[PDB]
Write a protein that binds this DNA or RNA. Sequence first.
RNA 1: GAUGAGACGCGUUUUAGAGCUAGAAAUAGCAAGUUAAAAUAAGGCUAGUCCGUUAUCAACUUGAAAAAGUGGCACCGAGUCGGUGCUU
DNA 2: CGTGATTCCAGCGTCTCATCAAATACGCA
DNA 3: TGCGTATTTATTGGAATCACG
Length: 1360
Amino acid sequence: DKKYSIGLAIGTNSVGWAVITDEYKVPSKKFKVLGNTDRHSIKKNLIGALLFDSGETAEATRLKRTARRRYTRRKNRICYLQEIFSNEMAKVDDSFFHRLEESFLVEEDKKHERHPIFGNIVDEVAYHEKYPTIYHLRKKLVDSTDKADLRLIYLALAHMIKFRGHFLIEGDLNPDNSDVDKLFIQLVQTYNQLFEENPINASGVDAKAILSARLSKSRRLENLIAQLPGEKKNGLFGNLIALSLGLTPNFKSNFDLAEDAKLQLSKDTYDDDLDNLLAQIGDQYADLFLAAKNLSDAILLSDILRVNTEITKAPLSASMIKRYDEHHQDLTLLKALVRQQLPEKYKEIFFDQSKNGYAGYIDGGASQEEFYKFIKPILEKMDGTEELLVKLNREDLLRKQRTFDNGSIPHQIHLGELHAILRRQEDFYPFLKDNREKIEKILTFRIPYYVGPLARGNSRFAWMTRKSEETITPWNFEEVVDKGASAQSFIERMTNFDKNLPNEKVLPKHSLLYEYFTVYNELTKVKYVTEGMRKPAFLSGEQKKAIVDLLFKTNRKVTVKQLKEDYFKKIECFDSVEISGVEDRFNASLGTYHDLLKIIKDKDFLDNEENEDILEDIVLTLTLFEDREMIEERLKTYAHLFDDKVMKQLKRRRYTGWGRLSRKLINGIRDKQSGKTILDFLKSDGFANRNFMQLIHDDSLTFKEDIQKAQVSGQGDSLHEHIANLAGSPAIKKGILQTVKVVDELVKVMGRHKPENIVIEMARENKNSRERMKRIEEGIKELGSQILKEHPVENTQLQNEKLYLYYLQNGRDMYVDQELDINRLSDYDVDAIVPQSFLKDDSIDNKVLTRSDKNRGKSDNVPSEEVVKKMKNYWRQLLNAKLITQRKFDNLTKAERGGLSELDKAGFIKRQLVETRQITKHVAQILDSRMNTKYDENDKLIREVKVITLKSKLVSDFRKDFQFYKVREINNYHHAHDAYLNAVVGTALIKKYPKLESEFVYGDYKVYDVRKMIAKSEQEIGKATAKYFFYSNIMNFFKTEITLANGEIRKRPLIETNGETGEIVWDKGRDFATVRKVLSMPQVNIVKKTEVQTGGFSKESILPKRNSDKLIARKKDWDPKKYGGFDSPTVAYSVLVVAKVEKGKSKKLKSVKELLGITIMERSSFEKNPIDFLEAKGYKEVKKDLIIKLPKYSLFELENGRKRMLASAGELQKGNELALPSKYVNFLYLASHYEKLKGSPEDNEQKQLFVEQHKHYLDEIIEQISEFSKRVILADANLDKVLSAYNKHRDKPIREQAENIIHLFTLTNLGAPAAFKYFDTTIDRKRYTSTKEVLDATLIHQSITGLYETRIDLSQLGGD
RNA sequence: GAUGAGACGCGUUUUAGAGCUAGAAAUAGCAAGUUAAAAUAAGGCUAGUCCGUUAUCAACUUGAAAAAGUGGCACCGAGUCGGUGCUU
DNA sequence: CGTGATTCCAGCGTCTCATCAAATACGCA
DNA sequence: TGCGTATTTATTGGAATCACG
């Protein structure tokens, strides 16, 4: 019971735990079993694993929330449009909007005429005959000057507002500029007139078809550059073309500018950057930029609308009418040609909705792509369809007006069409003339991203602040929403608070206070020595002020030489001085001060300390906002101190990034006794010159005490809140929370005794043959070799490591100039550049293909320096072709030096011991805080529980070297097994090397890993001395013998004990047997975490009308039998009810008991009042006490070990684990991994001999699977088919049969049934669609660890 | 990458879009086919251009809810955990 | 007439704007 | 040379359908 340890394995879908003792034994304890059964106690081994679904992200929820908000706002836009038209529409037709709102209802449910637009059959038919589409009506309203019906005008405006296009372009977009040729020629002429010394020729360049083609952006750019003579990708006119296409070039090096100001047109106003540029370059660029703007508009418009704008003022309605006319003509031609040539297929094409024909393209679910793919061979087979096929090649055959590619239409086109309609119709309807502005605002209004939801303090996503409390509308939005405050909260609601003080916002990165603090902190520790003086001394306040004034303020960058010369000789009159504490140049620089001096040109204003806070606000404004107008609005407060030109210059400048410390730290806190802030202490601290870290960690000052006292707010908050603040995927956070709860429960298990040690290992989350072939080809081409031409090779064939190295090594040995043969791969060997006794490097950087074994020349160290000198030129040739990396080249060439130094072994042990990931560090912090809570009275932490972080590499090497193989397809026990091994390794490490604690164990322990660890070239005595081991390997003490290089083996003592304390750490004669017995234990606490299902109500797909009760109504008044609806609801949790239901026409009461599925939609109604919900469902006289809530994955034990996990009200899942013997697992791993098994060739031969001599294990495993299936699975057909398939392929090789058996293990796996394959036979899944059996089984409530159980006998809870 | 916020195109259903000719009707033949309104998780109250799909979740005793509490040891073994003895 | 046994199937693309953080690869005092 | 910094980042119910004897 005393001195136990806990090992854990954290994963995205599993958390394995194992409690071990000092002797590496897993205890077994009697746990009391609660409930109403005859069982009172059970025996449980303290090892197991918790299984749960992956933690989903909120991305889908966020997208659905945005979709809901957008739908609500679109409906509100339609409501506003109806509000504008309410009185006039009521004058014309009072029920028009009512018919529009009830158009969805069937004729029976309609309270008005079934025709929405006109209310009568004749007028509706006339409208649809005159206007086949809405675009015909839109074009008619745009062009015709006759008075139009109000209903048609409203319909056009509603279509425009409801579908208004994107807002990716700022400013107006005139649709007339559609002729690409004329505008391109004009831009070419302007460019030639600008740079007359560097003209270009545009003759024979039809840019319209080049840029308007349905091709890639970069492809079209390259084609246009190639077409233009003397034009390149980076050419200035090419830069203008890229700007039109969507790039952001500049004109710095183009013989004009001295800085790198950039201008872009697709974003922002663009009317201020252009003016600023023209202020420098005059009016020369005005015509060129006008032509560039025209071409940029034309490039978009030509692809958006091909129709010329001279004919009509609505180029989008005209384009859609052209689409309709082409569709009609092509449809008639296709009908005629098909009826003429292929009449038989005509019946299918135009009537079979199930096929991807025209009927399936229009009335069916087939899309444009599917329709084209189906009808292209038919068109090619026929004759006279050449034009139709040409149209199909351009994806312009039988097109619809509402297609998937209408997302490139900007809102400017719809706005222009709406404006044209309002201009035409304002003369007849005065209210249209009055509300034209309101309608345009409705169409063009878009909530700024920095404003967010327009809530009123009842939402957890909103941050908007209101100047006044009133209903927000587009017409008064700027009059209500505080845009500046909204953007300030938008930026600051997600920025990090100060590390020391959590209640204060952090300062901007480029704030003057931050830069001054950094400069003073850096100058605090600077020391200077002169020849005359004896001892180095710090800089005084006056000296630092003079240095800042003369160096940091005069020049942006300050160097050590500049400090020595420009100040000490000019002011201090010191000819020579040696300065320590700064190298090359200072890291801190007053760049913001220089920028402000350049902008405002006011030395006094910047130097004045009174104006400093105003600057702290100005820089905060510049960092906070990026919109020019709101930046000007925020700077209006300080606009009374600077001129309009200075204000504009400040507006144009931008800053990004945030600092790490707040003003409350730098100057917000003052020492009680001295009355000085951190900055004040940095300015003058006597001669000690304490830096920021010393100031915040000084007992003589109240800084640390005040920081801690203000840090108690939020200190030790809820565990869930702390885990949520961590950085990582939500699944990993769920795993961390489950691990912490498992640790707490395990501590509860052991009598409230904290474990001596805790070990953790978080598995890292998250074709290549073609990449390897590409790399080899690039290297060969760069080096100029032609070995690839001599010997053909394939991408996949390079997957073999030996052949991959062979092609990388120029078909030669890496150490010997002799050639190599592909046929003799077995005759060749793979050797590690750094020996296995020095590093566990299994990558290509370490593996090398060598024919011989003694050709290295040096066994202990890196191969002999003579071979290195011989192969240096060839290795350099390989490096120049990028066939190898630089680090492996250095490792190979280290034979030039004396050998592998202690730095290499220190790096190796650092690599092998600790993980660089910070998520494991945060998990260790959480565990240490929750376990080590006692505080020593000496201001120290009582580290009574050690938290160790181990890499998966160590456990994997342990398994692959000591034959503790794992197979993930057998069962989930491997999870727990890994945890156990982790614990063992961790304990076996910390007992073996107590002086490396700070390497792995979480804590502020002393650090020494260079001299005290690595010994001299003394294998026999180096380990015996204070040095741990000459070899850098961490787990070499586990093995009995260690192979040094190739061919020679050294021997270690059979019992490994600590050198200093003398404690026995590893008994190789007993510990291995204990580990084998632990891994062979059949009883492992595998727990599937029961979860109430959350998410969507049902399938989002809306099914058509159907006379079935499985459909879910989309709305309260919409009967699914007439309007369709959703189906396939998701059950959050089942409910076991014991009640009676009326049966027969006599309504006799009969006792019943069954599981009722409570869906996500009905969860709230059931939880509000279960009795009424059950009565509505049909049950009568429900017993509330016997109502049992069963979440998903609820465990039931029926009989003879059969365990079923509840998955729904009408389906179960397999809930048993197959405790396959470890011998079978090892045999399967060896046989399946017949190749690439790694290790010495003798070991590989021994493993192959074992596999060949234990072929009967295949039949034994088949019999085991059959027995387990008959005992638990009870899948007769699947088991019979598996047996037949196994008997059919008994003559297949051992590796294939082993892999097929691994696949066959899917039948008996835990969880939902799944289909698998045995060679070519495909076995499906037997689904247990009956939940009537679990009503008489034994329900099991399992705790998180599963040791604490409660068995409820459901047979007792029966009405009979 | 995670979290947020603004938008866009669709997609899907019901109805409108008269299908016509002949044929007792069934049914044949021919015609048309592009579009539109409504909804897009049921809905809730706080009534907002708000919120409704993330996370949390053995059971029992509590505690509104958070949260808390609720369960001999050792030994031999082992087909999913059993027995042996002590305490209990 | 349940009773298995079989089959099909499941909303989805495109932009903008932040913020943070760890991950990875140098910088540096 | 560790702290510090500059950019980059198919599954499993459900429903229907199909023998089906």
